[PDB]
Design an enzyme around this catalytic site. Structure first.
Site, PDB file in Angstrom:
ATOM      1  CB  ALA A   1      -9.425  10.370   2.293  1.00 18.76           C
ATOM      2  N   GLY A   2      -9.355  10.681   5.521  1.00 15.59           N
ATOM      3  CA  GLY A   2      -9.959  11.333   6.661  1.00 15.59           C
ATOM      4  C   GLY A   2      -9.052  11.651   7.820  1.00 15.59           C
TER       5      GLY A   2
ATOM      6  CB  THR B   1      14.745  31.247 -37.150  1.00 12.42           C
ATOM      7  OG1 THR B   1      14.043  32.488 -37.302  1.00 12.42           O
ATOM      8  CG2 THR B   1      15.969  31.463 -36.302  1.00 12.42           C
TER       9      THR B   1
ATOM     10  CB  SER C   1      15.843  -0.441  -8.747  1.00 12.18           C
ATOM     11  OG  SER C   1      14.927   0.240  -7.897  1.00 12.18           O
TER      12      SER C   1
ATOM     13  CG  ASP D   1      -0.076  -0.059   2.526  1.00 11.75           C
ATOM     14  OD1 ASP D   1       0.827  -0.919   2.622  1.00 11.75           O
ATOM     15  OD2 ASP D   1      -0.333   0.744   3.450  1.00 11.75           O
TER      16      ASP D   1
ATOM     17  CE1 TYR E   1       9.813  35.328 -31.191  1.00 11.11           C
ATOM     18  CE2 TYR E   1      11.495  35.194 -29.479  1.00 11.11           C
ATOM     19  CZ  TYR E   1      10.826  34.631 -30.557  1.00 11.11           C
ATOM     20  OH  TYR E   1      11.169  33.368 -30.995  1.00 11.11           O
TER      21      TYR E   1
ATOM     22  N   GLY F   1      10.666  30.381 -35.029  1.00  9.70           N
ATOM     23  CA  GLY F   1      11.196  30.049 -36.333  1.00  9.70           C
ATOM     24  C   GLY F   1      10.734  28.713 -36.863  1.00  9.70           C
TER      25      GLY F   1
ATOM     26  CE  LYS G   1      18.459   4.526  -3.975  1.00 14.77           C
ATOM     27  NZ  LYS G   1      18.295   5.088  -2.602  1.00 14.77           N
TER      28      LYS G   1
END
Length: 689
Positions: free
Chosen positions: A123-124, A459, A259, A60, A433, A466, A73
């Site tokens: 969340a609470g 350009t 990893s 989780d 510009y 450009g 890691k």
């Protein structure tokens, strides 16, 4: 032992038992090999997987965070999906609602009444109390957070919290008898709907729920209008704006792997086929998602309905997000560590030289500014996304990418306008510009609609006005990225010497390298792009509005730039029409943008004041720049900033990237960007599944 198979990690005999048949039903359909590894906690599992004892386990958010920290890691390889066939979800947003009318902001909650879904819930409780840490006056871990909160809010309803220990945290709950504040549906104000009802009935002033609660509680829009969302920038916004206004984002549970030598692919293949035979909605007597009557969520979430492969770019921090990580940090660090981090600014140096200049400014800053360093600009953005970096000045192309990843512009790099200027640059905003398409009036069969197959003058390749700007809204409609199959012949330095994009270019006084991307190529830059057009080579040229009236009126260069007026040339409006270079404000492509300092909406306020101070001492008119290290003076190479920007100027209305870059610029770049992919861009598109 370590056969050609994925060794899954189990944390309880029951879970270990499901993995038993899990392994066997596998050999029966010849799907990949899966052997189990009996452990007694996801944590033991994290240690196993990291020391080759095992290869996979599903964790989780909180553990994904500890699994990714520096000793282990591990990284999320796969996400669980929830919702249903029509609305699959991989994450939701924790939000803070409050009745419309009241006017407190997120930073003004002290003394109010709160409704919570339940003690310990995400969340609470953990996300909103982790973030509002700075306002709690709480020592740290040893002291019960619950006493800190009991003093912050006047009264609340927090199911599962101790009634006779912290009375006012259960004061507003509604369960009767022995059910008041109970940790179940027995307590009416329990859960999302419950914490919300607690707000509706008027028992509380704020409820900590998630994005969908209001929509499931009040199907009628009329009703929902009576509510507002408290955004992390101390502002309020409607309930269906949780996307741009939420406390945090909580991702789905995830399968983690190492990893290095992770065995990912092998792990995904096993998951891909198992989803196919024993997934959700299959005949299988044994299903990945589902558990016997007593036990629940073995190996995976019973409620789960599939797994999505997570892009390799995403690690545990990107998957979690900055808001989420901060909330975690805020619940386990000291009032010291939290205050230090909240106050200092971490800049993300890019490269060695830029890291050096940063260390330097760090000294002179007295530690006000600190440094993190990446290899590419993209990794720097990623660091700021996962909260490991605070700011970074970027160009428009990236301001956009950071804009699509939830980042906002803080201060703009106002242009010094080259040869001297005036003070008060912090409030005098430079417009940037104007990109425009110049054409010779001695040409009537060439108008911006009828450009296909004409001679174009650019350009250079990949240059704001450009190339990137014109080729953008001049290719948006179609969905091909063949910018070579449009315009018969064009001069665009940075193109294949033998293609149609390098046919009309000149060369080194004729004879040497032609089309080469530099002054070494006659018709190059806003100079040669205007020459290419002035000397009747191309029907149009793409440069800055200033290139025309800043090279004309017998004020140009050699023989070509002489005896040629301004009312002699013309612009090219998207409105199909066309007038002189004068009314260029009412006839131009988009506005090229200025580099701007980008950061998290939470850090904006504090970042802005710190940078204006750094400017007062090391700025162009800094009371310490000549005397001791100058902000805008890089080792002449644009380090951290552009060597010729006057000052960091305050954004005046423009507060988003859409507001900043502009509608026309975002459009050109968008089309463009979906031709040349950004692994980081798709990483952010995924995180919004």
């Amino acid at each position: 032992a370590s056969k050609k198979s994925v060794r899954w990690c189990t944390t309880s005999p029951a879970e270990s038992k499901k993995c038993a048949q899990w392994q066997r039903r596998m050999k029966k359909v010849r799907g990949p090999s899966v052997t189990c590894v009996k452990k007694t906690s996801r944590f033991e599992c994290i240690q196993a997987i990291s020391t080759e004892k095992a290869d996979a386990v599903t964790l989780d958010g909180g553990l994904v965070y500890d699994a990714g920290l520096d000793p282990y890691k591990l990284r999320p390889i796969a996400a669980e999906v929830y919702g249903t066939e029509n609305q699959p979800q991989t994450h939701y947003y924790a939000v803070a609602i409050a009745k419309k009318g009241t006017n407190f902001q997120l930073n003004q909650l002290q003394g109010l009444k709160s409704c919570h879904t339940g003690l310990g819930r995400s969340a609470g409780w953990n996300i909103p109390m982790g973030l509002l840490r700075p306002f709690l006056d709480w020592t740290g871990p040893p002291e019960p957070l619950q006493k800190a909160v009991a003093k912050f809010f006047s009264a609340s309803c927090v199911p599962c919290v101790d009634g006779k220990e912290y009375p006012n945290l259960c004061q507003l709950c509604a369960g009767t008898g022995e059910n008041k504040c109970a940790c179940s549906s027995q307590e009416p104000y329990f859960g999302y709907s419950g914490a919300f009802k607690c707000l509706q009935d008027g028992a509380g002033d704020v409820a900590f729920v998630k994005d969908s609660t209001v929509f499931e509680s009040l199907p009628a829009k009329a009703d929902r209008d009576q509510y507002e969302l408290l955004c992390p920038n101390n502002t309020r916004k409607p309930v269906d704006a949780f996307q741009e206004c939420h406390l945090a984002r909580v991702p789905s549970h995830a399968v983690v792997a190492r990893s290095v030598n992770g065995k990912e692919d092998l792990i995904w293949k096993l998951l891909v086929k198992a989803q196919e035979k024993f997934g959700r909605g299959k005949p299988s007597a044994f299903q990945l998602f589902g558990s016997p009557a007593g036990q629940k969520d073995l190996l995976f979430k019973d409620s789960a309905l599939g797994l999505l492969r997570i892009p390799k770019k995403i690690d545990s921090g990107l998957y979690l997000g900055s808001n989420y990580i901060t909330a975690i940090r805020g619940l386990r660090e000291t009032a010291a560590e939290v205050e230090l981090r909240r106050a200092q600014v971490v800049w993300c140096a890019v490269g060695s030289d830029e890291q050096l200049k940063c260390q330097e400014w760090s000294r002179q800053s007295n530690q006000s500014v600190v440094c993190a360093t990446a290899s590419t600009t993209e990794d720097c953005i990623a660091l700021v996304l996962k909260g490991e970096a605070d700011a970074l000045s970027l160009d428009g192309g990236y301001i956009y990418i950071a804009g699509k990843c939830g980042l906002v512009p803080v201060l703009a790099e106002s242009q010094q306008s080259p040869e001297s200027s005036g003070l008060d640059c912090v409030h005098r905003p430079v417009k940037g510009y104007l990109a425009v398409a110049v054409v010779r009036k001695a040409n009537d069969k060439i108008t911006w609609n009828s450009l296909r197959g004409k001679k174009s003058c650019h350009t250079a390749v990949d240059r704001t006005a450009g190339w990137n700007i014109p080729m953008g809204p001049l290719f948006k409609d179609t969905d091909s990225c063949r910018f070579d199959e449009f315009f018969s012949q064009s001069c665009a330095p940075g193109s294949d010497p033998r293609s149609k994009l390098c046919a009309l270019c000149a060369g080194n006084e004729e004879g040497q390298l032609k089309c080469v991307p530099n002054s070494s190529e006659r018709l190059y830059g806003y100079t040669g792009a205007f020459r290419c057009l002035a000397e009747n080579v191309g029907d149009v040229a793409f440069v800055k509005d200033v290139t025309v009236l800043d090279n004309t009126d017998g004020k140009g260069t050699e023989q070509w730039a002489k005896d040629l007026k301004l009312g002699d040339f013309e612009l090219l409006c998207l409105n199909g029409t066309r007038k002189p270079v004068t009314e260029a404000e009412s006839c131009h492509l988009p506005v090229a943008p200025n580099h701007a300092v980008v950061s998290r909406i939470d850090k904006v306020a504090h970042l802005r004041q710190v940078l204006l101070r750094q400017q007062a001492h090391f700025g162009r008119n800094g009371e310490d720049c000549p005397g001791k290290f100058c902000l805008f003076q890089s080792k002449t190479k644009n380090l951290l900033f552009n060597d010729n920007t006057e000052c960091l100027a305050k954004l005046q209305g423009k507060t988003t990237y859409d507001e900043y870059l502009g509608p026309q610029y975002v459009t050109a770049i968008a089309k463009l960007r979906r031709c040349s992919t950004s692994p980081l861009l798709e990483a952010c598109a995924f995180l919004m599944r």
